[PDB]
Design a protein around this ligand. Structure first.
Ligand SMILES: N[C@@H](Cc1ccccc1)C(=O)O
Ligand code: CUZ
Ligand code: CUZ
Ligand code: CUA
Ligand code: CUA
Ligand SMILES: [Ca+2]
Ligand SMILES: [Ca+2]
Ligand SMILES: [Cl-]
Ligand SMILES: [Cl-]
Ligand SMILES: [K+]
Ligand SMILES: [K+]
Ligand code: NA
Ligand code: NA
Lengths: 586, 586
């Protein structure tokens, strides 16, 4: 398997890395492991202006006031259990959001703050018949309402919820109240079932409390039952949110129609659907095991045909210390990170099942040392029925001595491992910033990107509507619109000249600058920076972008094009002249 | 005969040979790479807001940024490492911000920005380089754009006698201004000699024009040479003025009725010259012709005669003007007598011999051009290892090219820069690696592994958080031991230690509207065991590495229970390293 990509060669896969607490999404080439692009999401990007521009702040909504995010879990939309390459979704644990990235323009195009919850952690997508729902875990138990009268996690109105978002509209679809809490989640290959791990069945807030129970569980959701209750109007709402809320808690030991709780040791973490659709596999973490839930026993479980929820468990292999996550080669082997033992363990799922029935058999095939303390791992196409068994990435949390010293803060070590054969082979150590937790790979032919924007793209359609009210034709006009103490500058941009090279305003005016890059070539980006005003944005071919700032300083203020576009790029500049306040009405 | 055949593969467990410090371009950070692997080992936030470490959110970072903490953007170009006796000493890295007119200093032992200055009475810090000999006493910085003085909105005319820009000298060690020199025209790039007496800067806008045609009118602009000794003498004698409310000594380096200043000489050089690079043998200031297909070589040892009025014509210090190709922008050196220049139009690196160019300028028929290597595409800066020092080792060359086109997988309308690693150890340049990068790093600098020495854990006396230690002292707090909540009206100052896997303060209660400061001291002594702190749905995030104290301030504006958690995976029980803020309603 080609390991190195030389000058002029292309990578064979796209990799989409979470940015962790840095808040962006990163696009890598695999197997070179080089970063090809950064996609700002919850971070503020000085380069493109994401978080500064009107278009990006419109997408972020009120959450544009936050300059931080914490993302863990990127996933690609699917149709019939295969990537369709339309969208990538990712969580924000810090400010309780889900974001959608359009993979044709490689930008976040939608973002939602999940109502009535704290901390969106686990996230994964419906596989079949396609990604109708984005499933997302809120990790922390809170009071409802959370108005400061009740703080007790044991109150009957303290709980967290499972969250389903409509992938296409990026509006909430429903929420399910659960017992305990929620960690990671995955979905089956039928559309009926989803599952999530819980580690705080104790509803405690201290370390010892959260470890009290020998088993927590994975909670299984019957989405068909949830949808049926929603259509029937059998739901409630919380606070000011219209999201249908269904109650998936037990009451007096009796199960709800929406959930079943399978006892699983212990503070389990990863929750991974095998690529043959057979199992939800939960990583035992504090228990040295994984628990294998037979998806084809779930209908019987929900129909009272089983005596004990544990009856849906058909394997519980002992693997090593600190199992966190599992992935799949598509040849019937699973791969699990051992955080404490600092290894990846390769094991055969069907032999673990046979061992659980007492048939003594060694289901462990190999243990590979990684460096060090691995969290997530990802095999190429593992989340689809096309799992190809070629590449594996294990994302480790302590790199110690594997890279040059760079001070007290160390990079992470994401190691690329060749799994095309019987023996796992460590091939590359990839240092990364800010703790990517998880990543996802896609074949090159599964991603189709645009090189020039469409003029009707929804990303800036609101800006086009604003332009229309001013009588502006964005493709041709270079005009300064005045409206009280607001100034709206509309210009075209074409290397190496701004279409409006100077304009004059009053001190204190609120200035919006809208720029349309009227170029037709590829890779001809322009920028716009106003010196000493904290103003910066990108405009790529056929894109319209805009930004708003207050001209709070009298005098002459230069603006310039930031994106090197030309031999005369140093010279693509303009001037904003600000008349002093003492010369205008006080 | 000697071949170019260095290894570029750095396998698992092997370490890079050099550090690379890349500018973050319009994204605003500095990036630490390993060379020759070209992998990114660390990101150092400077002018960007970093969600991961909290740079731009924490009190320590906003203290360093001062009032400029209000800006969320920067635009970097030119990273340089401090020198002693013309060799890198590994103490500091400096970098410019063109967007908000700043210079930042990075401490290379902790890999953090530790000082920042907004340069007074200028717009757009672009060109930047360090004094070499006897050490980096001054940071020299170009303000690119001509502005009115004062810039109070009375005069906008850039031809006015009080419209100009200035050359800036910052005291490298105190990061206070040392002096400014008014110049004719504008300033592009700058470098310094190997004695401390002279510095020089290219000027592309000798015309003081605002339009593209106006800026290209003069057949020749110049490089302006500064007699720094003469500037220092005048400051010591008190022969200076000050501008506005800045105490910075200001010297007038303009020509007056054709009469030269004591501080400057203007050497005519074609055309809109751009790069300004000092050869590693200290013989030449080499100015790249850009619009002229040449480089101009200024003999540094003729400059004393120039300033003494011993030379008939300022062109007499020009001793070479090789013709190289289309669009020469920047030059670097292998220490063997060759220069390497980027040809932006021809899209090449041209290797040429400086002493042979000097002889050609006298009329000898000698071919000084050795090789032209195609690069991909449109190179700007380039950098050979240790080129800025008398130890230039002739091993590696990076050319930083602005259009990557088809050299990487497509990733939408925006494309990465192509930073290409070239083996120059032998007679033939050899292209060995294409490195995609984000946001146009413009330039980079390399250092031997043994020139950089970093701390593995923080010193408790570190100036970086000394103001926080002082705050703690005023509250009677011992940061190494204490877990306490101080109440001060509507202000709450929480102080806690942190150790995997538990915050030293796991709950605290405040009043809605209180201003909360959380100060955390990581009392681990194990390398690489960093913790984080995130307050859910409050926009609060920061890093605390071993023995560091970090603090962050936010308003508790939402009643109810609000979770905080450790963002840095630190322990098998990382998910459970959490606490609760309880906010009582008003
Ligand atoms: N400059 C005034 C505000 C004002 C300006 C212009 C019109 C009306 C009111 C003060 O207060
Ligand atoms: Cu958020 S957890 Cu194992 Cu996913 Cu990192
Ligand atoms: Cu700022 S310019 Cu040729 Cu240096 Cu990039
Ligand atoms: Cu437009 Cu550089
Ligand atoms: Cu401290 Cu994770
Ligand atoms: Ca538990
Ligand atoms: Ca000129
Ligand atoms: Cl998982
Ligand atoms: Cl230069
Ligand atoms: K780490
Ligand atoms: K570019
Ligand atoms: Na939205
Ligand atoms: Na300062």
């Amino acid at each position: 398997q080609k390991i190195h990509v030389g000058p002029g060669e292309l990578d064979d896969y796209y990799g989409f890395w979470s940015g962790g607490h840095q808040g962006e999404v990163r696009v890598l080439g695999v197997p070179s492991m080089r970063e090809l692009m950064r996609i700002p999401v919850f971070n503020v990007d000085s380069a493109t202006g994401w978080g500064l521009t009107n278009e990006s702040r419109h997408i972020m909504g009120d959450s544009a006031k936050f300059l931080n995010g914490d993302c863990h879990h990127p996933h690609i939309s699917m149709t019939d259990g295969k990537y369709d390459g339309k969208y990538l979704f990712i969580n924000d644990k810090a400010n309780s959001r889900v974001a959608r990235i359009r993979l044709d323009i490689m930008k976040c195009d939608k973002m939602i703050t999940v109502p009535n919850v704290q901390a969106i952690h686990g996230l994964r997508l419906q596989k079949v018949p396609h990604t109708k729902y984005v499933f997302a875990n809120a990790e922390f138990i809170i009071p409802h309402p959370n108005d400061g009268k009740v703080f007790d996690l044991q109150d009957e109105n303290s709980y967290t919820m499972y969250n389903a978002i409509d992938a296409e509209t990026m509006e909430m679809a429903f929420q399910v109240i659960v017992d305990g809490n929620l960690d990671n989640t995955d979905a089956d290959y039928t559309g009926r079932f989803a599952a999530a791990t819980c580690y705080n069945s104790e509803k405690a807030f201290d370390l010892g409390g959260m470890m009290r129970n020998e088993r927590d569980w994975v909670v299984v959701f019957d989405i068909h039952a949830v949808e049926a209750a929603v259509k029937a109007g059998d739901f409630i709402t919380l606070g000011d949110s219209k999201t249908p809320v269904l109650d998936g808690r037990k009451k007096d030991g009796k199960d709800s129609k929406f959930t079943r709780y399978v006892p699983v040791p212990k503070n389990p973490h990863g929750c991974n659907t095998s690529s043959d659709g057979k199992y939800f596999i939960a990583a035992g973490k504090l228990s040295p095991t994984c628990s294998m839930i037979a998806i084809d026993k779930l209908p019987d479980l929900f129909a009272g045909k089983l005596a004990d929820p544990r009856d849906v468990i058909v394997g519980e292999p002992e693997l090593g210390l600190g199992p966190l996550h599992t992935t799949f080669d598509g040849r019937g082997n699973a791969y699990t990170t051992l955080f404490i033992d600092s290894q990846v363990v390769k094991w055969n799922m069907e032999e673990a099942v046979r061992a659980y029935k007492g048939e003594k058999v060694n289901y462990i095939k190999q243990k590979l040392d990684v460096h060090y303390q691995p969290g997530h791992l990802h095999a190429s196409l593992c989340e689809t029925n096309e799992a190809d068994g070629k590449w594996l990435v294990a994302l480790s949390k302590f790199s110690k001595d594997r890279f040059l010293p760079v001070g007290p803060l160390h990079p992470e070590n994401d190691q690329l491992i060749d799994i095309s054969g019987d023996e796992m082979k460590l091939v590359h150590d990839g240092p990364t910033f800010a703790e990517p937790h998880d990543c996802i790979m896609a074949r090159r032919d599964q991603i189709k990107t645009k090189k020039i924007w469409d003029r009707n793209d929804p990303f800036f359609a609101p800006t086009v509507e604003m332009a229309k009210k001013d009588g502006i034709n964005l493709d041709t006009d270079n005009k300064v619109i005045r409206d009280g103490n607001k100034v709206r500058v509309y210009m075209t941009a074409m290397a190496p000249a701004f279409g409006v090279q100077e304009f004059t305003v009053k001190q204190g005016d609120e200035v919006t600058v809208t720029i349309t890059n009227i170029a037709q070539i590829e890779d001809v980006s322009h920028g716009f920076v106003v010196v000493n005003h904290g103003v910066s944005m990108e405009i790529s071919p056929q894109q319209t972008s805009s930004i708003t700032f207050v001209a709070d300083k009298p005098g002459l203020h230069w603006y310039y094009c930031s994106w090197f576009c030309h031999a005369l790029h140093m010279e693509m500049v303009g001037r904003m002249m600000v008349e002093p306040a003492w010369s205008h009405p006080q």
